[PDB]
Amino acid sequence: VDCTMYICGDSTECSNLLLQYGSFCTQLNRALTGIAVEQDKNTQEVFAQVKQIYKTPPIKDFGGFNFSQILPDPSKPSKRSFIEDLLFNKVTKFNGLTVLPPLLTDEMIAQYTSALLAGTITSGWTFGAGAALQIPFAMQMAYRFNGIGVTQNVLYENQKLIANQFNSAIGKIQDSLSSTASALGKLQDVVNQNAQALNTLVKQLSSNFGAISSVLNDILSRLDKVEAEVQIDRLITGRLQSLQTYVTQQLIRAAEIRASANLAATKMSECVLGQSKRVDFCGKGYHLMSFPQSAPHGVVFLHVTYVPAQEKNFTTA
Amino acid sequence: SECVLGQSKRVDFCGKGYHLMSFPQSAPHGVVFLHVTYVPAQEKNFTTAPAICHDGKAHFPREGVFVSNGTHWFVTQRNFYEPQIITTDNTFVSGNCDVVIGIVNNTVYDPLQPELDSFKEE
Amino acid sequence: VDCTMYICGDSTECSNLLLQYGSFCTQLNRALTGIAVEQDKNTQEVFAQ
Amino acid sequence: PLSETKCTLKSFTVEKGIYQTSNFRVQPTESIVRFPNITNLCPFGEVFNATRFASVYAWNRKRISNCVADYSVLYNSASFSTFKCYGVSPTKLNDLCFTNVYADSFVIRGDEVRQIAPGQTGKIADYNYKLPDDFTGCVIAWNSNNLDSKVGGNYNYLYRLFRKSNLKPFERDIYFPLQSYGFQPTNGVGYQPYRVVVLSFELLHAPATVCGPKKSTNLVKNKCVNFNFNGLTGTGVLTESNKKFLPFQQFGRDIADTTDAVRDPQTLEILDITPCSFGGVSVITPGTNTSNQVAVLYQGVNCTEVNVFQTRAGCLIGAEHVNNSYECDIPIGAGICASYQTSQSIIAYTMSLGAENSVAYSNNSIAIPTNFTISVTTEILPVSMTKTS
Numbered sequence: 018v019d020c021t022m023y024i025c026g027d028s029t030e031c032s033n034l035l036l037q038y039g040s041f042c043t044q045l046n047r048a049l050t051g052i053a054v055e056q057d058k059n060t061q062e063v064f065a066q067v068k069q070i071y072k073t074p075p076i077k078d079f080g081g082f083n084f085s086q087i088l089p090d091p092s093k094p095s096k097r098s099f100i101e102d103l104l105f106n107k108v109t110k111f112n113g114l115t116v117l118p119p120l121l122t123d124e125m126i127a128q129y130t131s132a133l134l135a136g137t138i139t140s141g142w143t144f145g146a147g148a149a150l151q152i153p154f155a156m157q158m159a160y161r162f163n164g165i166g167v168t169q170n171v172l173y174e175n176q177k178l179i180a181n182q183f184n185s186a187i188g189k190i191q192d193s194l195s196s197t198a199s200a201l202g203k204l205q206d207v208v209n210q211n212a213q214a215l216n217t218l219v220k221q222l223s224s225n226f227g228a229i230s231s232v233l234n235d236i237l238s239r240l241d242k243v244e245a246e247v248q249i250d251r252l253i254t255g256r257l258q259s260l261q262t263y264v265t266q267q268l269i270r271a272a273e274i275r276a277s278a279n280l281a282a283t284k285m286s287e288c289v290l291g292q293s294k295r296v297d298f299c300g301k302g303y304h305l306m307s308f309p310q311s312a313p314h315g316v317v318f319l320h321v322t323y324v325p326a327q328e329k330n331f332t333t334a
Numbered sequence: 335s336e337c338v339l340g341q342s343k344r345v346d347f348c349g350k351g352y353h354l355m356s357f358p359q360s361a362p363h364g365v366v367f368l369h370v371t372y373v374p375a376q377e378k379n380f381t382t383a384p385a386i387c388h389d390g391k392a393h394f395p396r397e398g399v400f401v402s403n404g405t406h407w408f409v410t411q412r413n414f415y416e417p418q419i420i421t422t423d424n425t426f427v428s429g430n431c432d433v434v435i436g437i438v439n440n441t442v443y444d445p446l447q448p449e450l451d452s453f454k455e456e
Numbered sequence: 457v458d459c460t461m462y463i464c465g466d467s468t469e470c471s472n473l474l475l476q477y478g479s480f481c482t483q484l485n486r487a488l489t490g491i492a493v494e495q496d497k498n499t500q501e502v503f504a505q
Numbered sequence: 506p507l508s509e510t511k512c513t514l515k516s517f518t519v520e521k522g523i524y525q526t527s528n529f530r531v532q533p534t535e536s537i538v539r540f541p542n543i544t545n546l547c548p549f550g551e552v553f554n555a556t557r558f559a560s561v562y563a564w565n566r567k568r569i570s571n572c573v574a575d576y577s578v579l580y581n582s583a584s585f586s587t588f589k590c591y592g593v594s595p596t597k598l599n600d601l602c603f604t605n606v607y608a609d610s611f612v613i614r615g616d617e618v619r620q621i622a623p624g625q626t627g628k629i630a631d632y633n634y635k636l637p638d639d640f641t642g643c644v645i646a647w648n649s650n651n652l653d654s655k656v657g658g659n660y661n662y663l664y665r666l667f668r669k670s671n672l673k674p675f676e677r678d679i680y681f682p683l684q685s686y687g688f689q690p691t692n693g694v695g696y697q698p699y700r701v702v703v704l705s706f707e708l709l710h711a712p713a714t715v716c717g718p719k720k721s722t723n724l725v726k727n728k729c730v731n732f733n734f735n736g737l738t739g740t741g742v743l744t745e746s747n748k749k750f751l752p753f754q755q756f757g758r759d760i761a762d763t764t765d766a767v768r769d770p771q772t773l774e775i776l777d778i779t780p781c782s783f784g785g786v787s788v789i790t791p792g793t794n795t796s797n798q799v800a801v802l803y804q805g806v807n808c809t810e811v812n813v814f815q816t817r818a819g820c821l822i823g824a825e826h827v828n829n830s831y832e833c834d835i836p837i838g839a840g841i842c843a844s845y846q847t848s849q850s851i852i853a854y855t856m857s858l859g860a861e862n863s864v865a866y867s868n869n870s871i872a873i874p875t876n877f878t879i880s881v882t883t884e885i886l887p888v889s890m891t892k893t894s
């Protein structure tokens with residue numbers, strides 16, 4: 018916000034009065050710029066986990082697993098995944114207000130996510146530690162199975178089944194995202210609470226705060242100097258209060274988003290670059306792996322987890 | 335708590351790479367952690383198999399990976415190349431070997447048979 | 457809190473003056489209600505495991 | 506720009522970074538004023554010169570519409586003992602342009618001229634003629650011995666000393682509650698007759714008709730100017746509008762309660778107001794300890810307004826655009842970053858996400874490390890801050 022442009026029009030008479038209130042109209046700018054750069058830092062921390070831009074091999078014989086849904090489409094302008102294209106569709110000035118574009122454009126985020134996903138697919142957790150070390154995907158899944166305490170043979174003897182279930186589950190998610198938009202609510206609210214705040218701030222320019230008129234140009238065109246400043250300062254006070262309330266709300270909300278981004282970065286590190294032994298930290302059931310996906314101002318993790326089923330009693334000692 | 339008073343299994347929590355240990359240091363209004371981490375380096379390719387069919391039975395490694403240096407097969411731990419001979423005690427068995435895709439024919443050495451032969455000689 | 461009941465008593469004279477301060481009451485009530493539902497979310501996410 | 510940042514930081518050394526330091530804003534080039542080109546002159550000169558004024562008993566009311574006024578000649582005249590305005594300045598009255606004017610005429614005691622101000626209290630206010638709190642106008646009064654005072658007492662003039670209820674503002678009504686003044690030229694000024702005229706304007710919420718002497722001017726379009734339509738005054742760029750105003754509408758009001766469209770008062774034409782271009786100005790600078798070079802980013806406005814390079818973040822000036830990516834130094838926005846490099850220049854470029862690589866994946870090949878390195882990594886975390894009180 019150009020707080021001078023918000024509080025006062027393009028008028029010097031009001032600017033001079035605003036000036037003798039001190040550094041408020043620079044403290045607000047400082048705070049807002051801090052928030053703006055913190056958003057860039059959040060996105061960087063979440064997605065800059067990978068040192069290099071890995072990419073998939075041309076041939077996709079990943080032991081029967083079918084990642085074509087989450088890997089980038091080679092033919093698309095922006096190299097986004099098919100699922101990422103669902104998310105980017107299910108989420109939807111004149112007073113000194115302005116929106117700076119994010120440093121990393123959405124295709125840059127898509128590049129980061131595709132690099133992470135390709136690294137995970139072709140080298141498991143090894144690229145998370147140091148340089149990527151290729152491994153057949155079947156063996157990677159075998160060792161994750163071993164990690165969750167199941168003898169790796171169980172995978173190999175059931176590979177064709179375990180692939181299908183996986184290929185089945187990745188279908189289900191599509192049905193969930195394409196049909197119901199409500200899934201993205203978590204992001205949408207964050208957008209709404211921002212827009213709703215903005216819509217309020219501008220609306221406060223339409224109020225008197227006790228002056229004779231909300232529009233400042235009319236006050237100037239009616240009252241001369243001494244009896245005009247008495248009214249202009251009322252608008253100065255009211256609009257400073259409104260802008261300070263907005264900035265305080267934005268600071269608190271940005272702190273909340275900072276916490277959320279820190280959680281997201283931790284989840285990326287501990288579930289995409291490795292395997293989490295922390296229960297319920299990445300999906301219900303025993304964690305096998307995770308796949309990141311970009312979304313407008315957010316990240317979607319697909320947690321592939323192992324759930325026991327069809328249990329039998331036995332007597333034990 | 336997790337990096338200094340212990341060893342963290344959480345990846346990238348106590349520094350890049352596998353966490354070995356950590357050391358705290360004071361600083362004006364802050365703390366500096368020195369994360370000692372283990373980073374693999376100087377890697378080599380190897381052909382590999384998920385299991386081995388020896389007697390018609392599928393053999394799997396108890397730890398590590400089956401890796402071939404081009405003409406011979408060994409079993410080596412996951413994170414450091416140390417080729418060991420494929421023994422009946424480096425591995426375990428599960429049923430017939432037609433059920434696994436990508437299995438490779440090879441022999442698995444058994445330490446008892448040499449003793450059997452030695453006793454038969456004596 | 458119902459600020460119109462807090463800032464102003466039963467009088468309409470105070471209510472009319474408060475009205476031309478804009479949506480300050482709406483903002484405060486909205487924030488407090490957000491906190492209120494946030495508490496329910498907090499309890500749910502802890503015990504609805 | 507570099508010194509602009511230096512002041513903004515209150516420092517003589519500016520560390521490498523991007524600093525917001527000012528606001529680009531286009532000044533208007535000329536002033537345009539439009540008014541309904543009526544030729545009639547207002548009849549004010551008659552209300553101040555009527556033979557017989559009314560009395561607050563039946564205070565007289567006159568209405569003014571469809572005429573051009575000149576209040577300077579009235580304000581500067583010598584006969585007027587008191588001329589005080591509320592909600593508008595006496596000198597400004599030539600700048601505004603109203604929908605209607607109400608002139609109320611009466612006579613009153615000189616002591617009672619203190620009792621006519623808006624929201625004031627007293628018998629002449631609550632029992633004869635009450636001015637409201639929302640009054641916007643001018644109260645005018647002058648002593649009238651030679652007009653309304655005569656030997657034997659000018660009994661023609663009446664007022665109410667009692668009423669069963671206080672008046673609503675601008676109300677008129679017709680023991681005994683009425684009494685006449687004793688206007689004799691012998692009597693003291695406090696009791697001498699004062700002629701009082703109250704002018705209440707109606708500020709424009711509709712086509713203005715009683716309107717100032719300012720000369721109308723031919724307008725221009727697509728250029729930032731100062732505009733004034735019927736007193737609605739501001740700054741912006743005018744353009745032809747595609748909005749379909751209904752015939753009774755004068756201006757379109759935006760979400761921010763600002764007029765985004767106005768009808769030309771002297772034509773059916775409908776014009777759209779756009780706040781002419783503005784934006785933030787940031788300074789991309791390397792450390793002053795390295796170089797005094799600098800580049801400027803005008804945010805949200807492209808370069809036809811202000812080497813030069815257009816970006817999704819804005820118009821960048823000074824920096825040189827080069828297509829080969831780097832781990833980007835100074836973040837400009839939308840993938841563009843700037844840096845200082847050796848000619849010595851500020852380059853701007855699309856950032857590099859990282860080295861491009863592909864893993865040698867195959868369905869039977871695995872890579873294993875043969876060696877290792879022990880790495881010590883620093884991690885600094887703030888634990889507390891100064892305990893200020």
Ligand SMILES: *[C@@H]1O[C@H](CO)[C@@H](O[C@@H]2O[C@H](CO)[C@@H](O)[C@H](O)[C@H]2NC(C)=O)[C@H](O)[C@H]1NC(C)=O
Pocket residue numbers: 083085086
């Ligand atoms: C991976 O799954 C996708 C669908 O998720 C398969 O794509 C289908 O391929 C058939 C055959 O060409 C088409 O008729 C369908 O229209 C495709 N569906 C979609 C949604 O694209 C793909 O064949 C699978 N690949 C493998 C190797 O299993």
Ligand SMILES: *[C@@H]1O[C@H](CO)[C@@H](O[C@@H]2O[C@H](CO)[C@@H](O)[C@H](O)[C@H]2NC(C)=O)[C@H](O)[C@H]1NC(C)=O
Pocket residue numbers: 403404405406
């Ligand atoms: C794979 O490893 C085996 C075991 O070391 C290699 O065979 C040995 O080769 C050396 C000469 O380099 C001989 O002195 C040994 O007698 C061999 N041992 C056996 C058991 O054959 C083999 O050459 C290696 N192959 C490759 C391609 O590296």
Ligand SMILES: *[C@@H]1O[C@H](CO)[C@@H](O[C@@H]2O[C@H](CO)[C@@H](O)[C@H](O)[C@H]2NC(C)=O)[C@H](O)[C@H]1NC(C)=O
Pocket residue numbers: 437438439
């Ligand atoms: C591993 O070796 C066995 C023999 O020791 C192979 O089994 C033979 O396979 C052929 C072709 O399928 C059959 O005609 C024979 O009847 C099989 N014999 C036995 C005893 O099973 C097996 O194909 C080899 N596998 C690999 C991967 O080399």
Ligand SMILES: *[C@@H]1O[C@H](CO)[C@@H](O[C@@H]2O[C@H](CO)[C@@H](O)[C@H](O)[C@H]2NC(C)=O)[C@H](O)[C@H]1NC(C)=O
Pocket residue numbers: 376875876877878
């Ligand atoms: C594993 O790596 C270490 C170094 O990280 C190697 O040791 C180096 O050997 C060269 C031989 O010329 C010396 O010049 C260096 O000074 C050694 N470094 C250290 C830290 O001692 C070691 O040889 C490697 N091992 C293998 C099997 O390749």
Ligand SMILES: *[C@@H]1O[C@H](CO)[C@@H](O)[C@H](O)[C@H]1NC(C)=O
Pocket residue numbers: 330
């Ligand atoms: C096996 O477990 C189920 C659990 O619901 C129980 O109902 C059933 O009685 C058990 N079987 C026997 C033989 O007790």
Ligand SMILES: *[C@@H]1O[C@H](CO)[C@@H](O)[C@H](O)[C@H]1NC(C)=O
Pocket residue numbers: 379865
């Ligand atoms: C070994 O791996 C490298 C990649 O690190 C690859 O370029 C090379 O072709 C591989 N060797 C063989 C024999 O395929």
Ligand SMILES: *[C@@H]1O[C@H](CO)[C@@H](O)[C@H](O)[C@H]1NC(C)=O
Pocket residue numbers: 078435436868869
């Ligand atoms: C590996 O890929 C090759 C490609 O030609 C194929 O012939 C072979 O059957 C595959 N084997 C496994 C185990 O995936």
Ligand SMILES: *[C@@H]1O[C@H](CO)[C@@H](O)[C@H](O)[C@H]1NC(C)=O
Pocket residue numbers: 550551553554579582584
């Ligand atoms: C009408 O009244 C004004 C104001 O007192 C005065 O200046 C003017 O002379 C009067 N008109 C005539 C014809 O005297």
Ligand SMILES: *[C@@H]1O[C@H](CO)[C@@H](O)[C@H](O)[C@H]1NC(C)=O
Pocket residue numbers: 542544771772
């Ligand atoms: C007032 O302006 C109109 C243009 O809309 C013009 O036609 C008219 O002649 C003007 N008035 C007079 C008295 O000429």
Ligand SMILES: *[C@@H]1O[C@H](CO)[C@@H](O)[C@H](O)[C@H]1NC(C)=O
Pocket residue numbers: 794795
């Ligand atoms: C930075 O400032 C120091 C102290 O003035 C100076 O010694 C040094 O040369 C400067 N850096 C460069 C690159 O000139």
Ligand SMILES: *[C@@H]1O[C@H](CO)[C@@H](O)[C@H](O)[C@H]1NC(C)=O
Pocket residue numbers: 807808809810
């Ligand atoms: C500003 O940019 C838009 C879109 O890039 C372009 O159409 C417009 O012409 C530019 N400004 C001017 C004054 O042309």
Ligand SMILES: *[C@@H]1O[C@H](CO)[C@@H](O)[C@H](O)[C@H]1NC(C)=O
Pocket residue numbers: 828
């Ligand atoms: C940058 O792009 C232009 C065309 O857009 C091309 O002619 C030029 O060669 C590119 N830069 C370099 C260093 O080649």
